[PDB]
């Protein structure tokens, strides 16, 4: 509270890694059906079923121009992109599949680097 400081991380590294993270992701094999804007003029429903549309590319310019405040902005920003996987593709379809692959690879991923 007001002038009770809580003991807070050191955040100067969070920027690089979780640019690391990103390119990570962006050159992993499943990363395909992540790496650009879904066409929402060539997929039918998805303009009207996804509310908040987010892949790589996007997520990367975000991060490039400060638009993340914090690591868990990044992080919200990243399970979108695998919520909104889940939410339109069968699990037992390529994107489908792809979506759980990535999901899985970033929460590791993540583990290793912040979670002590
Ligand atoms: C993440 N990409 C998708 O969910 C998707 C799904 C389909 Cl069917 C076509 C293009 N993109």
Not at 25 to 33: F, G, I, K, Q, R
Not at 67 to 90: I, K, S
């Amino acid at each position: 509270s007001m002038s009770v400081k809580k003991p807070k991380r050191d955040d100067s590294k969070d920027l690089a890694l979780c640019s690391m993270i990103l390119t990570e992701m962006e050159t992993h094999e499943d990363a395909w059906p992540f790496l650009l804007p879904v066409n929402l003029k060539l997929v039918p429903g998805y303009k009207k079923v996804i509310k908040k549309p987010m892949d790589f590319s996007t997520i990367r310019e975000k991060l490039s121009s400060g638009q993340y405040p914090n690591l868990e902005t990044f992080a919200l920003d990243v399970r979108l992109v695998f919520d909104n996987c889940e939410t339109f593709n069968e699990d037992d379809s390529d994107i489908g599949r792809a979506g759980h692959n990535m999901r899985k690879y970033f929460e590791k991923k993540w583990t290793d680097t912040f979670k002590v």
